[PDB]
Amino acid sequence: EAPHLVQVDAARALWPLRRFWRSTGFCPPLPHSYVLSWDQQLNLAYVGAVPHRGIKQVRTHWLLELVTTRGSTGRGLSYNFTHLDGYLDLLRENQLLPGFELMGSASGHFTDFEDKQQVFEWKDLVSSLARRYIGRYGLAHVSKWNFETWNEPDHHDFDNVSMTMQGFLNYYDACSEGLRAASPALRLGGPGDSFHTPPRSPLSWGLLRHCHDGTNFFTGEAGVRLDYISLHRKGARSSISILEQEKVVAQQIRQLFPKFADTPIYNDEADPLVGWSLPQPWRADVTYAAMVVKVIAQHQNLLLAAFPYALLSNDNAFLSYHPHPFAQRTLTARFQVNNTRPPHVQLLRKPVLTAMGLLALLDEEQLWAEVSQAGTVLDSNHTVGVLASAHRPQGPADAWRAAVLIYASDDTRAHPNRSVAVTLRLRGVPPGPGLVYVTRYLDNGLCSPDGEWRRLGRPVFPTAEQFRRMRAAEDPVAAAPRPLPAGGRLTLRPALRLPSLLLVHVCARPEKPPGQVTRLRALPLTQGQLVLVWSDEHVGSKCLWTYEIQFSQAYTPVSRKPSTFNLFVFSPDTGAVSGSYRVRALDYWARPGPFSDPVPYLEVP
Ligand SMILES: *[C@@H]1O[C@H](CO)[C@@H](O[C@@H]2O[C@H](CO)[C@@H](O[C@@H]3O[C@H](CO[C@H]4O[C@H](CO)[C@@H](O)[C@H](O)[C@@H]4O)[C@@H](O)[C@H](O[C@H]4O[C@H](CO)[C@@H](O)[C@H](O)[C@@H]4O)[C@@H]3O)[C@H](O)[C@H]2NC(C)=O)[C@H](O)[C@H]1NC(C)=O
Ligand SMILES: *[C@@H]1O[C@H](CO)[C@@H](O[C@@H]2O[C@H](CO)[C@@H](O)[C@H](O)[C@H]2NC(C)=O)[C@H](O)[C@H]1NC(C)=O
Ligand SMILES: *[C@@H]1O[C@H](CO)[C@@H](O)[C@H](O)[C@H]1NC(C)=O
Ligand SMILES: CN1[C@@H]2[C@@H](C(=O)O)[C@@H](O)[C@H](O)[C@@H](O)[C@@H]21
Ligand SMILES: [Cl-]
């Protein structure tokens, strides 16, 4: 068993690296009017706390069931946007954007998209919505949003809404014109389905044909705007299978629809396995996290480094249910702790979520890298692979960086007995002030809250103490900053588990220390516990060791594992949580940034 050799050249910056994977999504349960519950508020706090904007978009189904109506077509029709405002504000509060599927019936009003009056009403609803949120958040903000068709139109998922082939095209034109009437800057794509071989997926292929050659319902004009094409293709447990399927569909689009040769393609349900709620042990831990990284690596290395692929979304923002808090396709593990007064909810950060924080350390340029075993060169379509990046500095709060993310993953298969010897030879590091490197490591032995849960006997309602034990496995194992050797080379010989993730971060020292933590808030969990959450928007550099939290009832530091996750659950052994909190960044050279404004918290008994 010859070791895997991973060579990286930090002088050879090859091309841009785009962070095309910063998306998640979910569907609310039946009936369609949850998204405003404390559970969801906590869930989106965890999603937005991934550092350095590591998750940006939350693709959310049934948004237009958050709109209700009064009156009627003949009486005079009014919309109540209150609940939609709530969800969108909640996203905004967490620095997230909706993947805005135009999906729903506005509480039973819309029934038939071949009914001429309804198609007109839809256009005006879409325009009203768009103008409303342009007013609420500014056009710059709303024009970042991916507006999209109704989810999976060929999967008959319409409630009491008749959506025939022709109805879908009318609906589309109403979406397209509605948005256009508000602003030409707004983006719309679709269909968000499989694109199986014809005669399958008629509404998906039909939409493309309509937009390429058909006639606009409202303007009679040939051709209709289509700013991106969204497909769904999942792996059936194979990672590389996702890409293979995407290439077939993308090639069929290129030849059949020449006007869409450059039209960006999204896979906004790019999951290892269909069926989020189906319990799978690999979904619980680093097996899934490493596979998600591998899928992304494959896409960067075997596709983008030429079809116009722009977005990949792991559809994993669902909330898990008893009796499978960890084993569902979710970023967090939900515990409904019913036996307190009152009942409360706790979430644990699962490794997949933690991995998104490692991916987020990748910067804007891809570096040359090569993996080989015994002299044979191995591309990312193998169990071990790599993604390496570099940062070009600008400011004095900034300096050169390299991030090298290595994965060991056999898709959904874990191999607890195996050890994979890896030699990382990093060469070409430009000279710079105070060059240091930091490792962060994840595997099922060291960083699996699921594993801790099972070691504790799978408590259905964990005690506070059991929760602390479980959370102690959330973060990666980090080695403190070490100076780089002289000469600009670094050679390391880690033993990786299968699965595992290792991020090697090499940073030059910026002239100035980190910026200020902002937007600190304290959220109640239960007597004796709260969540602290904040933004790293003005922190500057990614060369961060931890966030120092201080508490005052003189300010005292709160002792904890190092973490760059922009969220912390504070569950002191004493239950003493009333007082003031403040947080600051601590960088790799032990320099603090300035404290956040203090945030007071008074518990009510
Ligand atoms: C602590 O208190 C909480 C409530 O505050 C309880 O939470 C409920 O827990 C049960 C699980 O024990 C949940 O029931 C499950 O609901 C799932 C989703 O239901 C919705 O969505 C589906 C599909 O999208 C619809 O079909 C359905 O009508 C709902 O709208 C179901 O998918 C689950 O079904 C699976 O397992 C069951 C067997 O139990 C089978 O019947 C099914 O075939 C399927 O494979 C399941 O029914 C319930 O949703 C939770 N409620 C809430 C509000 O979240 C906790 O149970 C309680 N803790 C303890 C330990 O008692
Ligand atoms: C990824 O590697 C696999 C090999 O594991 C490739 O799939 C094989 O292709 C051969 C011939 O082309 C087929 O006979 C087999 O069905 C495949 N083998 C196995 C064991 O699955 C696949 O082509 C590679 N994919 C990419 C995108 O490079
Ligand atoms: C709109 O809906 C909200 C939430 O259901 C409700 O509280 C509010 O009063 C409604 N407004 C009107 C004008 O009906
Ligand atoms: C086909 N069904 C998948 C489903 C799942 O696999 O659970 C889930 O990701 C989405 O809510 C649906 O839009 C797609
Ligand atoms: Cl999956």
Author numbering: 27 to 59, 64 to 335, 340 to 587, 591 to 642
Q: What did the study's authors say about this model?
A:
In an attempt to fully define the conformational inhibition of compounds 1–3, raIDUA crystals were soaked with the ABPs for shorter durations. Data collected to 2.39 Å resolution on a crystal soaked with ABP 3 for 45 min revealed electron density in the active site of raIDUA consistent with the unreacted cyclophellitol aziridine 3. Interestingly, the pseudo‐glycoside was observed in a 2, 5B conformation, which is the predicted transition state for GH39 α‐l‐iduronisase. The majority of the interactions with active site residues were the same as those described for the covalent complex with raIDUA, although a shift in position of the glycoside indicated that the carboxylate group additionally interacted with Lys264. The hydroxyl group at C2 forms a hydrogen bond with the nucleophile Oϵ2 of Glu299, but at a surprisingly short distance of 2.4 Å, suggesting a tight interaction. This close proximity results in a distance between the pseudo‐anomeric carbon and Oϵ1 of only 2.9 Å. Superimposition of the main‐chain atoms for the two complexes revealed a shift in the position of the cyclophellitol aziridine to accommodate formation of the covalent bond. This engendered movement of between 0.2 and 0.4 Å at C5, C4, and C3, 0.5 Å at C2, 0.6 Å at the carbon at the position of the endocyclic oxygen, and 1.1 Å at the pseudo‐anomeric carbon.
Human α‐l‐iduronidase (IDUA), which belongs to the GH39 family in the Carbohydrate Active EnZyme (CAZy) classification, hydrolyzes terminal non‐reducing α‐l‐iduronic acid residues in glycoaminoglycans (GAGs), including dermatan sulfate (DS) and heparan sulfate (HS), through a two‐step Koshland double‐displacement mechanism. The active site of the enzyme contains a carboxylic acid/carboxylate pair that acts as an acid/base (Glu188) and a nucleophilic (Glu299) catalyst. Mutations in the gene encoding IDUA may result in mucopolysaccharidosis type I (MPS I), which is a rare autosomal inherited recessive disease that leads to toxic accumulation of HS and DS. The structures of IDUA when complexed with the inhibitors in a non‐covalent transition state mimicking form and a covalent enzyme‐bound form provide insights into its conformational itinerary.
